[PDB]
Design a protein around this ligand. Structure first.
Ligand SMILES: Cc1ccc2c(c1)nc(CCc1nc(C)c3ncccn13)n2-c1ccccc1
Ligand SMILES: [Mg+2]
Ligand SMILES: [Zn+2]
Length: 324
């Protein structure tokens, strides 16, 4: 049921050298992979190399894996190859800027987990899948897509020469799977509002504890949320576009619901192009600012993320108030 990569593709991944100019820009939180499609896979490699050592992974295995993952994203406007790497890139810049909070076991687990986080996304919501009445939602009742995404990740590693976590002991092995499992589960937005509520809480009562695992787990989940939406932390011209991608998905989900006589919720209704700016402002305030605000608080070096969200937010304000 899986999809691998022609020997051509992966071997040329090893040949790839990131051009000297993009080296300082890549370290920036607000860096935009967008202009560099040819490089996306090779950019993920370089970050692996720079994060966790030149060879935690045997090149060929990694490259095979990376390219096989590519081959398992669909060609939809938003939850596709570009987004997985964009998410990857933000985890990278997070991990780098928090150099000693995390373990090699986490940092490679997390970079992999973002790459895989939306594997084989079809371009439908959990809602749409459960609300009527898909085999994937027939299988996994809550967090429909995110479990599929992890099982997809799972089947990629279980392949011939793809198990880049092989050399690890079986204890360390099924442990990163546990990092990656929960990592991917966390990007179910539904679950995030609770997680943030709880973390909000812990930080106040001087109670949040990076030693405790299900505290670690929560801290990370928040990092996964924050990565996932980092669209909203890129320079405005990049944030305008990455939004256009997002609505072409939603509105394509709205259409499949109109085709049935059913009003889609307005975020997915193309008959509301002008309601969007307002809706975006709402999203920044109800979901985004909290996410980055609470991330900044727990991880101060990740402040530039909040700085940039804020910048976009007021850009979106300006669009509503009629100027820009
Ligand atoms: C008329 C309308 C109405 C609401 C809308 C909307 C358009 N649009 C959005 C949010 C759209 C959006 N932008 C990025 C970057 C996203 N990421 C993940 C999920 C949604 N995202 N809401 C919204 C606002 C507030 C909360 C949740 C969703
Ligand atoms: Mg997802
Ligand atoms: Zn995502």
């Amino acid at each position: 049921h899986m999809s691998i990569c022609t020997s051509e593709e992966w071997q040329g991944l090893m040949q790839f050298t990131l051009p000297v100019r993009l080296c300082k820009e890549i370290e920036l939180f607000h860096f935009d992979i967008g202009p560099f499609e040819n490089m996306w896979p090779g950019i993920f490699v370089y970050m692996v190399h720079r994060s966790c050592g030149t060879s935690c992974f045997e090149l060929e295995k990694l490259c095979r894996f990376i390219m096989s993952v590519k081959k398992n994203y669909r060609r939809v406007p938003y939850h596709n190859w570009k987004h997985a790497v964009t998410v990857a890139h933000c985890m990278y810049a997070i991990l780098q800027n928090n150099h000693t909070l995390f373990t090699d076991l986490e940092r490679k687990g997390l970079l992999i987990a973002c790459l895989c986080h939306d594997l084989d996304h079809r371009g439908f919501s959990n809602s749409y899948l459960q609300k009527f009445d898909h085999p994937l939602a027939a299988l996994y009742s809550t967090s429909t897509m995110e479990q599929h995404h992890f099982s997809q990740t799972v089947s990629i590693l279980q392949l011939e020469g793809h198990n880049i976590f092989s050399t690890l002991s079986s204890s360390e092995y099924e442990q990163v799977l546990e990092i990656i499992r929960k990592a991917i589960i966390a990007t179910d937005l539904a679950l995030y509002f609770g997680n943030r509520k709880q973390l909000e809480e812990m930080y106040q009562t001087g109670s949040l504890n990076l030693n405790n695992q299900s505290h670690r787990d929560r801290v990370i989940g928040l990092m996964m949320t924050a990565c996932d939406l980092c669209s909203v932390t890129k320079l405005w011209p990049v944030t305008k576009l990455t939004a256009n991608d997002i609505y072409a998905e939603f509105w394509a989900e709205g259409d499949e619901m109109k085709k049935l006589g059913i009003q889609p919720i307005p975020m997915m209704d193309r008959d509301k192009k002008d309601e969007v700016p307002q809706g975006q402002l709402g999203f920044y305030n109800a979901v985004a600012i909290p996410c980055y605000t609470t991330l900044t608080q727990i991880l101060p070096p990740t402040e530039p993320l909040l700085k940039a969200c804020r910048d976009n937010l007021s850009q979106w304000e300006k669009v509503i108030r009629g100027e820009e």
